[PDB]
Design a protein around this ligand. Structure first.
Ligand SMILES: COc1ccccc1CCOc1cncc2nnc(CC(C)C)n12
Ligand SMILES: [Mg+2]
Ligand SMILES: [Zn+2]
Length: 338
């Protein structure tokens, strides 16, 4: 494979070469062409000193990055561009929030690798759909819960177990065991049902203050940071929020259509005939995204701008809701749509 040849023999490009604003919270990683994303991953890993610190073999790393990218399918939202944008936000947190004062180096490295792998082989359907459709994934994981997240983790392990792809094969038994355990915890933390279960523990940690000597605080912070990366499309401008809503609802309505064909009644948000996008977006902002970034701001004062962008994006949806009502006649001047 020629992509691999170039990635290995051409040299890792400097991060600043990608974009002058690459390391800023205002940068939109989705603006980077998909063909440049595997090289951007290598550049971020190098800028974070992970390649040198952990003595990662370059042929192995190049193969791993390409295998992770190939491990994503093309649904509208849960594709490689989502994994890349989530990974870029983890890199932004490292560059702007001084994570090294809070987490161990192996934990920051595990968070980044988990961001790359966290939605591997997503089929554009959620956990409830797996169970309702009696998929092979549900047969394997429904008794434990977080069906898709267990599959994402198993796919990540399967890549590491592919010959020539194990970026941690030279690690000590203890460090290897630690990496794979962190990966499990972090990928499982991407289930928003898990986030909602631990929300009160996250609030309590923010209230008492982060204790770097408390192992449970490390586990909780990793969970919060992973959720913050996964929802990071909400921290950019209105243009990103709007585009992401189109992608998410295209994916959800496709599931809703499959559910109807199965004879089931899909949830309102999955039903293209019932869903009212501005209301659904405002609800997700108020009850999920805004509390996450408010917690992040409470723990990291420098994360204030992220909460303010999510709050402003919620106000933009309220501002444009009136446009979802047809006033006067449509463009064609006919009422044929009735
Ligand atoms: C009340 O809505 C929710 C509560 C909990 C979990 C799920 C949702 C559905 C709406 O989700 C979303 C809506 N807009 C943006 C967004 N980004 N990430 C996600 C989760 C999605 C990929 C599963 N989003
Ligand atoms: Mg996911
Ligand atoms: Zn995700």
């Amino acid at each position: 494979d020629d992509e691999y040849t170039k990635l290995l023999h051409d040299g890792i490009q400097p991060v600043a070469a990608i974009d002058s604003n690459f390391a800023s919270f205002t940068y939109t990683p989705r603006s980077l062409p998909e063909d440049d994303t595997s090289m951007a991953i290598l550049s971020m890993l190098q800028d974070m000193n992970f390649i040198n610190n952990y003595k990662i073999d370059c042929p192995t790393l190049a193969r791993f990055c390409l295998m992770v990218k190939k491990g994503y399918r093309d649904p509208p939202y849960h594709n490689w561009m989502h994994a890349f944008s989530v990974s870029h936000f983890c890199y932004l947190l490292y560059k702007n929030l001084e994570l090294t004062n809070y987490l161990e180096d192996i934990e920051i490295f595990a968070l980044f690798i988990s961001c790359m792998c966290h939605d591997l082989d997503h089929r554009g359907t959620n956990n409830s759909f797996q169970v309702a459709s009696k998929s092979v994934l549900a047969a394997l994981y429904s008794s434990e819960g977080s069906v898709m997240e267990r599959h994402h983790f198993a796919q990540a392990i399967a890549i590491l177990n592919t010959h020539g792809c194990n970026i941690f094969d030279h690690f000590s038994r203890k460090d290897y065991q630690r990496m794979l355990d962190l990966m499990r915890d972090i990928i499982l933390a991407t289930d928003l049902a898990h986030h909602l279960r631990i929300f009160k523990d996250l609030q309590k940690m923010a209230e008492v203050g982060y204790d770097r000597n408390n192992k449970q605080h490390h586990r909780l912070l990793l969970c919060l940071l992973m959720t913050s990366c996964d929802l990071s499309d909400q921290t950019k401008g209105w243009k990103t929020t709007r585009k992401i809503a189109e992608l998410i609802y295209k994916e959800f309505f496709s599931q809703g259509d499959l559910e109807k064909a199965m004879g089931n009644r899909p949830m309102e948000m999955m039903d293209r005939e019932k869903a009212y996008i501005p209301e659904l977006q405002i609800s997700f902002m108020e009850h999920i995204a805004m509390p996450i970034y408010k917690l992040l701001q409470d723990l990291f004062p420098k994360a204030a701008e992220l909460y303010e962008r999510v709050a402003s994006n919620r106000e933009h949806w309220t501002k444009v809701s009136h446009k979802f009502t047809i006033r006067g006649l449509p463009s064609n001047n006919s009422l044929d749509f009735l």
